[PDB]
Amino acid sequence: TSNLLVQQVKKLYKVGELLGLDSETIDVLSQPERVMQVKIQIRSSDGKLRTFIGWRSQHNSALGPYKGGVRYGPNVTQDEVIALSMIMTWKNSLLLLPYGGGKGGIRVDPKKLTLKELEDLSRKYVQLIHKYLGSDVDIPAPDINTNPQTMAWFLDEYIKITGKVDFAVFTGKPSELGGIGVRLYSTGLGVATIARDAANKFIGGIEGSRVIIQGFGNVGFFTAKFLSEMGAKIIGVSDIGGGVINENGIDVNRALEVVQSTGSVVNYLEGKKVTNEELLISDCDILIPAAVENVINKFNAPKVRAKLIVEGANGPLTADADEIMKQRGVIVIPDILANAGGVVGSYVEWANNRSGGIISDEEAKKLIVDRMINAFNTLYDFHKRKFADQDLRTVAMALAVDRVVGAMKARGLL
Amino acid sequence: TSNLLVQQVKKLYKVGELLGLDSETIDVLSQPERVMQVKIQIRSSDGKLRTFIGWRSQHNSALGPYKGGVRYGPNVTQDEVIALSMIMTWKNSLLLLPYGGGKGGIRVDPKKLTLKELEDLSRKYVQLIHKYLGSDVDIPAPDINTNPQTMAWFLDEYIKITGKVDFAVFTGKPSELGGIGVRLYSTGLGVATIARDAANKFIGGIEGSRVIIQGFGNVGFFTAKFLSEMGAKIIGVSDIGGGVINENGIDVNRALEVVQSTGSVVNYLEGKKVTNEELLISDCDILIPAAVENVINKFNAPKVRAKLIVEGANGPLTADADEIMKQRGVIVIPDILANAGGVVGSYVEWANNRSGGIISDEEAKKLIVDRMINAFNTLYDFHKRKFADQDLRTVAMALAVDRVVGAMKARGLL
Amino acid sequence: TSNLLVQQVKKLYKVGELLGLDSETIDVLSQPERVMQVKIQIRSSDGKLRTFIGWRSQHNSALGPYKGGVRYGPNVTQDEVIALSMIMTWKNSLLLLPYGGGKGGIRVDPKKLTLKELEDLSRKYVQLIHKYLGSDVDIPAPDINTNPQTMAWFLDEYIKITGKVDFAVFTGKPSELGGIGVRLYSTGLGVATIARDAANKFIGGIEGSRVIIQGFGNVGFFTAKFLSEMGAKIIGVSDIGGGVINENGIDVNRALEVVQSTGSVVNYLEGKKVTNEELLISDCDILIPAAVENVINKFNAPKVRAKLIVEGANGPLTADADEIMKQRGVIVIPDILANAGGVVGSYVEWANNRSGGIISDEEAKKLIVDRMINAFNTLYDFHKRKFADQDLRTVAMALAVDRVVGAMKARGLL
Amino acid sequence: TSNLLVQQVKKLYKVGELLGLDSETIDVLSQPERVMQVKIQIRSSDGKLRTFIGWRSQHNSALGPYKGGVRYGPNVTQDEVIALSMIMTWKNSLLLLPYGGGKGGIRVDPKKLTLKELEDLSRKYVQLIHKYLGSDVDIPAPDINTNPQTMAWFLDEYIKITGKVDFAVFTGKPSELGGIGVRLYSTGLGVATIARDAANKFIGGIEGSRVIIQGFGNVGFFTAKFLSEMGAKIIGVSDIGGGVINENGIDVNRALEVVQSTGSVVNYLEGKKVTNEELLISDCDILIPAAVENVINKFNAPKVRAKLIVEGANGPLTADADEIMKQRGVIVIPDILANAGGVVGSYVEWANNRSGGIISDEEAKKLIVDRMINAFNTLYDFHKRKFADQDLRTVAMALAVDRVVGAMKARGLL
Ligand SMILES: NC(=O)c1ccc[n+]([C@@H]2O[C@H](COP(=O)([O-])OP(=O)(O)OC[C@H]3O[C@@H](n4cnc5c(N)ncnc54)[C@H](O)[C@@H]3O)[C@@H](O)[C@H]2O)c1
Ligand SMILES: NC(=O)c1ccc[n+]([C@@H]2O[C@H](COP(=O)([O-])OP(=O)(O)OC[C@H]3O[C@@H](n4cnc5c(N)ncnc54)[C@H](O)[C@@H]3O)[C@@H](O)[C@H]2O)c1
Ligand SMILES: NC(=O)c1ccc[n+]([C@@H]2O[C@H](COP(=O)([O-])OP(=O)(O)OC[C@H]3O[C@@H](n4cnc5c(N)ncnc54)[C@H](O)[C@@H]3O)[C@@H](O)[C@H]2O)c1
Ligand SMILES: NC(=O)c1ccc[n+]([C@@H]2O[C@H](COP(=O)([O-])OP(=O)(O)OC[C@H]3O[C@@H](n4cnc5c(N)ncnc54)[C@H](O)[C@@H]3O)[C@@H](O)[C@H]2O)c1
Ligand SMILES: O=C(O)CCC(=O)C(=O)O
Ligand SMILES: O=C(O)CCC(=O)C(=O)O
Ligand SMILES: O=C(O)CCC(=O)C(=O)O
């Protein structure tokens, strides 16, 4: 139902071969433990009854309860949600979080629903799967087209159903409902932090580096903002409405005001308007896919001009694109490290909730950044000492998949 | 992963149109409420690890908890299980049972596993979905390649997990584990009873009728036994191994002894060995598909030679076949009526379990036969007055769908 | 700590060998699945704190939830409670009830506690084991020195803890708290029914038959009353205070008056006062142990003068006694049949609770009496064809054990 | 069935009398609240069915949920398991942990089972008691012949049954499954820390002190390793295969190599081979029982040559031995203090799980070591002022019991 699953299975096959895993073990890791599909009907403002389908994929729980966000979008499919859940397994393993991989999606265009409709949609999604949710079973969060407001609805419905004011069942919550202020921008803070560290290690430094970012929402906006503060030059931004290239630099806050008033960054007046396709293959130092998956494939990988790719989106490169970047000498900082700001921020939110709320937002910001940087340093050091002939995704996946396999063996599952 | 779902959805649109239901209502009905996919891995003693995928489709619960069996089979798919779960919703509604429709399947060749491997499989299937099973949630049962032994494993695992000796969570159980003796043969008793009644109504009676049955398992054997006892001549039986025709009559018990000692009824000595395709188009009075779906289609339907077809299997004739039978004046008694002796018997088992186990076996036999004759008579009489331009299948589905819709309306769901 | 467990295990290995069971299979059956020991402390009316030990033995659950009574007594031990739970398994199997074998007891002299102290004891007993009780887990009942009042306390504590008004968690309840009138006297009705039927089969009938009953409580009294009404002559009754013999017959209702006003039937004026030992070896036609276990043994079995022993008590004869009675031509009707009116009455009470209370007292009486006579008649006819070289106890045990083994095999447990 | 329970109850009445407790109060403390016995049957690799008995003793829960390990061994009995659970109560009280005393064991020779057989055993053990386990009910852990691998199986079974990924239900877990690195060696670190501190207080310090350790497993090895690093001379080690003495010192890492390659430290080439009996009475400065209970008794206590005994094992000295060591001027550091590094490490693991995993390995090490030294220093200073006429064990028990009694009084239980 989606090519992302084909890509994510192929990336797993490649690391499994490198680890010397048996074919059958790879098969177990390639398939999710449990997937739920659910029907949601809502009565719209116009009086019309509409039916939507959603999923929750629970890929792997060797290392703890399932963890991952929920996306709303008109092209969401079962296999997309499954694939996204597999990326969560690896990310959570890499960052040594006590979490397996989970993900959800509803096949809907949220831009065409009222707030009341979206609320009703959100509540019913939780209602239909809740026997397989819990703060120690499967903890959702935001993703494309969901946000702290979605999480407040999710939480309120869970409280309604279970009677338990369990803050820890959802992350990305508003800070007045048990969330943490840092989680709002923790993905982009992590992508910026990692991009800067990566640029210092690999391309001569971040200062004056020309950066193109695809997508301008929760990840893309904050990534732009923080990279701008760090002295990079943001020369390209885009969203679903298209992109803008300006070699003089984009005013990031102004661009957000353009989205707020017009609905797309493409309406930014000073710059060359471009297709998303053109934006990805335009000249830059660093390219940061921050929107959707499979945006760089066997067709455009040969035309990417960036020296350094940092993955803010989940699964923006196909398995072919991986091989092409390796052959071309383009350094790719993988999603499972680069974007882990999100889930590491959720971890702190979740642990704070379990602890009864005693972590400050300033401690939380430090905890997130430190884990991210420490993870990068571990990855770099394993790369240099054990897998110097492999790309960084391969090394990160080797660490991630090795840990999952060990835990499943200990538990008698393999 | 199957056309059986395409067929069921298409039938529902036609029936909804006939009932004057709007597109939006039909959309709700055509989508399952919840479907779970689960991964099962097993290590043989040979040492090899194998992975199997299974499903539980919970189609509709307007009228009660989900109810339906679980098939094992190497060609089982997600769409096949969803489709069979829709057939269960309608047959359950048609027979005025307090149940909605569900079904499960695992994609495995059970003939290639050891008994211990099958047990491990069956236990793990139940474990992986159990939070959405229960005696007032979803009550499984047998189907193809599963049986009382399978239900003993299901039950024992469920006891392990829940701590509760809730006999009612599964039907088709062994008598010594909360089952009822009549359930073993209730489907085939129902098929024979219905075939006799229809034969009396339409082709001059059951005595001396030449009957051909495809499949010789739980449905097919007992159908054959009861029709033998009722005066009919069984001239053809079959199974996955092929069939056997003898115009002088098959000895039904000897034939089972052939299955038992050789693995297939095709080894019966006294008759012509034939393929299944050939059995289905051989001369007879009554033809009873009792194996698998979609065995009679636009290609062999013109060649079938029977006066009366009684559907023991779920979904044995395609819509093209129904059309051709109508034109040819071949009577078809639909599965949702004819084979409902299984799920009615399961109702009696489940009710007996809930009431603490009091209902005697004889009264059980009576309750099943009465309900099924009454349903046929009701449907027969109804058809004279409304939907006279439609086949029996269409009328039966119309009543089944109408009842479901009425319950959803009452519950504020539509 | 009780010779009763040695008798039970020893009797079990003999039956296993006759059934041709592996030694390893018998090892499984000879050990309970779960046994709980609990501590109960009570602040007495004097002001003294006292500690009591109690147990719950859950022996086998192959055929259903554990079922059996709780006894209070100063000589109660862990192994007595285990042994009595094994007897429950075999009797529940024999009578084809959907129940396994359980038993409880507390090591206490209840005659030296106040009512409020006995309440506190009873409540604490249920509290400390409740996570392994339930109407589909383990359903307790009365036994020695417990009664419907005890059951009412047990129930009220279970409702307090769980918040569910689940009447089916205890049987022997008062009829205003979900009990049934017939359960008060169903044990004695069963014993009397069975004694008359055996008397008709083997000694020319009940009318004028001289009966001696040991024990005059729930089992003893009702046995006496019903045998009197059936036309037997009750020539001897006893309780823990001693016995009374009157060859002209005892007035049973008057004897109960004597017990209520003096505390022992030994104070019955018109008769010869005897020790319990003397009672058991006194001349009579029918002897009915209806007090405690192991009362007839290698020392007094040679001196018993009855034609027919009917076991009201659990385990009144030792294995040596069985051998002597066989050699002497004394017919013994084993406890697992003769006394099953209690647990069969419990079954009706439990099913009635589960059903919502449908079944009337008169239907209930009939169901119990019929199951008993049917069971005796089945056992009798069976015994002519199979195990004709063994006594009635042995053939009953053979059937009982065989059914359990079959259910365990079905469940993969053996 | 173990002399250990007699020692414990006897030691308890002495402490009670010193505390001025009523005999009736001591009766309550001397009896466990709940004890479960379970049956476990396993189909072995040969094809033979074997049955094993196991127990869970939940002794006291006044101060919190029950806490303590599970031991596998062919001499394990119900009363040994009860006695060890009492030791847990007193040590958890002494260390001011929010836990009561529990213990488990299974009567089995684990050295004669395959890994798969041990897995099956472990899983079934947890399954049969799970309704009285939970992270706030009863938290098990390792002991003799159990280890983090055992804990992983226990956990995976608990997740299977409950569907909750509750890491805090077991401690001693692998660090990838919610364990902590320091827990592997926290018992030995505690013993070594305490031995050094006592050596400094009482014998002029640890450097060059001659140490003899009985047992070379989780406690024994790490004790040896850490004392070596602290500058002690390890002159004697043993295991169930016998012992080795070398007055020049044993190479501790080499000895573990010998164990791994030969199965016993007795195969250590450079040293005099001795019986365990001989080891215990060999000349040394510090003697550390770190294997089993009751190894020093009235027969060998007169012949022990150490200045200082530090109890790594539970219950290694009998009451007679305590009296002799007191008369001889041999200082004994009791198990409830010396060995509490295990359960204090378990506490940190459990709190860390509840907190969401905040606490680092280095903070964890510090917390354990500090609580131990603080506890020893508190006990030392206390002992100068109160109970100065009693040994260290007696004063520790006095505090431990007094805290429990106070908590029970507060709860109305006493
Ligand atoms: N939110 C999180 O914490 C988080 C964490 C890790 C990774 N991610 C990944 O980051 C990516 C973006 O998530 P988000 O939270 O920023 O979502 P968002 O809904 O806040 O923003 C999505 C942005 O992408 C744009 N976009 C959508 N479809 C596009 C298309 N086809 N081409 C170009 N741009 C398009 C939108 O217009 C918008 O700017 C996704 O892959 C998501 O899985 C998100
Ligand atoms: N078991 C019930 O109570 C019940 C109730 C209603 C409907 N049904 C339906 O009846 C049919 C038979 O089920 P069953 O319970 O008797 O199954 P079963 O496993 O007991 O028997 C199946 C029989 O069909 C044969 N068969 C299998 N694949 C075949 C193929 N490709 N071609 C020909 N024969 C084949 C087998 O060899 C065997 O003889 C199925 O459609 C099932 O869903 C069963
Ligand atoms: N109550 C039931 O439903 C039921 C059912 C089946 C079997 N049983 C068995 O029947 C027997 C009696 O049970 P009950 O319910 O009548 O008990 P009960 O407490 O109602 O009466 C016990 C009677 O036995 C007497 N007794 C006690 N100890 C004695 C001794 N050592 N010697 C002589 N007499 C003694 C008492 O004085 C009293 O008369 C027990 O073995 C019990 O397990 C009871
Ligand atoms: N593991 C813990 O966290 C912990 C904590 C506190 C106390 N303890 C106690 O420490 C002792 C040892 O536990 P462990 O975890 O090290 O066990 P283990 O299974 O890791 O090692 C046991 C060691 O003792 C040896 N041994 C066994 N029986 C023996 C015998 N009869 N004579 C001599 N040596 C024998 C074995 O060969 C092995 O070297 C036990 O008393 C245990 O209850 C353990
Ligand atoms: O914060 C989370 O747990 C979910 C974020 C996410 O889904 C992601 O990392 O892509
Ligand atoms: O008896 C049942 O519940 C299952 C019956 C069924 O699945 C069927 O009718 O095909
Ligand atoms: O009625 C019951 O369940 C208990 C009866 C009993 O314990 C017994 O038969 O001895």
Ligand SMILES: O=C(O)CCC(=O)C(=O)O
């Ligand atoms: O760490 C635990 O909980 C168990 C330790 C233990 O059993 C012991 O102290 O002997």
